Design a binder for this molecule. Structure first.
Ligand code: 30S
Lengths: 288, 287
């Protein structure tokens, strides 16, 4: 009926999703986290309401189209409230949403700024190697082309529970070492890229009875780890990562290499970086 | 004030996404379509409420505890869009149908897509009304009146303007006949550069929002065949910002600067509803 705490004091807005009509608030009480979510429309109540004279405020009118502001009764004004008390730093860590900034990296920016910066860090990818040499997740391999050069391993994502095709999420990791990202791609990688695309899709079809036209097959520019990997997701499954600011379709990557051999070494790639990322400042400094 | 219709009579629920807190309703008023969307939370208006004793109803408890909050009139806003009159193709537009992917080669566009498109597509009168100031004149954020390289920057209908979190603006070109990405050649470079640059500088002036906070893109297979550029807040997982439809303006320009014949010759990838006749046409053509 009431708050499990005496007084709230908003310290920071952890995360918010304007799309999902949700807010995540960190507050010092008497530390507590309060989640507020707008409720989905109930078909019946909404129908019932619209079939009666409501309180409307015409925003604008344009031809057959018109927008309004509706104020419905108490029933249709429900708000989902979740309270986390007490909440530690690790509790805030999971709901921490960093401000993203966009950057346009040219080939020279990559060569001079990006490449030396990532070379300075020792991002270990031993977990990747363990997958490839079957020391880990061997039981999860859906398909494998063992070719040391043009070969790959198709494993389903760990976040995917495999109990439905609606959220089908698979990842192809190439056997060959040294292809850190999209920037390392040249026409010599075409047989490997064509296998990941063709062999991967044919494996999804055989195993999961899922046609290629139901699949979104892409690469990430500025990937989470620097050993080439391609994502196979169900088309109906929408998620950050499948967005234009990061995803690059494999079919398109292949066709670019077929047209311009030097494409990914010379062309300007667009991606997002966290505001606090040192690489962001480095590129901004370089571009002025 | 009153609705534009003589009562409502729900015939079919076109779409209902519990995730997006939105409903699409078809009703006989004559035919009318009513879209209802829950509004995103306004940081201040919510911070004003929580610092005051509210009406809560405890659902569950464990560190976790769920409640039911009933806020005042202000925080109870609902975005209402009314389409009156609405056609059969208008009803088809909001139906939850399975999506299929297609890779359209230059020749597929010329032979299949272009003639299909030419057979008929939507009335774009609302677009024309914006351009000739017959509608939404008070909403224009910037205008370059050049008949050829000019445009109009306006907040899109899908944005309530009460927060920057979901900033969605659209730039519509003044020039008629550029239906889509396929019509683009180097002659359109001044127009495209003008949208990219002037559009971003208008967002900066009006909304104090830097370009690095913006995602600027085109849609392949657009809903309206009159060239338009979307300006969205990067943090917003905007509808159609996905790789299977969105094409960054900066990239569209650079492609034209490199290959003049790029969009006439290259193979474009997009999704279509399973029930769409264009989908069958292209599938039939590709075998
Ligand atoms: S319709 O064209 O299918 C449609 C359906 C639902 C919502 C919007 C639209 C088309 O968009 C608009 C219609 C009328 C006016 C308008 N004005 C602005 N500023 N933006 C948009 N997006 C529209």
């Amino acid at each position: 009926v009431r708050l499990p705490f005496s007084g709230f004091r908003l310290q920071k807005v952890l995360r918010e999703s304007a799309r999902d009509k949700i807010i995540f608030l960190h507050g010092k009480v008497n530390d507590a986290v309060v989640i507020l979510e707008k409720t989905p429309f109930q078909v019946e109540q909404v129908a019932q309401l619209l079939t009666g004279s409501p309180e409307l405020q015409l925003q604008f009118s344009n031809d057959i189209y018109s927008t309004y502001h509706l104020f419905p009764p108490r029933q249709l004004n429900d708000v989902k409230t979740t309270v986390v008390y007490p909440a530690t730093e690790k509790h805030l860590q999971k709901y921490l949403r960093q401000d993203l900034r966009l950057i346009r990296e040219t080939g020279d920016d990559y060569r001079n700024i990006t490449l030396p910066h990532l070379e300075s860090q020792s991002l270990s990818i031993q977990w990747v190697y363990n997958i490839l040499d079957k020391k880990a997740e061997a039981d999860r391999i859906v398909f494998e082309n063992p070719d040391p050069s043009d070969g790959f391993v198709l494993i389903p994502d760990l976040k995917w529970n495999q109990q439905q095709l609606d959220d089908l999420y698979l990842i192809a990791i190439c056997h060959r070492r040294g292809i850190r990202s999209l920037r390392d791609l040249t026409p010599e990688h075409l047989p490997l890229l064509r296998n990941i695309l063709h062999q991967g899709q044919e494996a999804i079809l055989q195993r999961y009875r899922m046609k290629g036209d139901h699949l979104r097959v892409y690469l990430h520019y500025l990937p989470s780890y620097y050993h080439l990997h391609v994502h196979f997701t169900a088309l109906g499954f929408e998620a950050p990562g499948s967005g234009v600011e990061r995803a690059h379709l494999l079919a398109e990557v292949i066709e670019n290499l077929e047209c311009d051999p030097r494409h990914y070494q010379q062309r300007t790639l667009t991606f997002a970086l966290r505001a606090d990322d040192p690489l962001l400042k480095l590129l901004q400094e370089a571009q002025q």
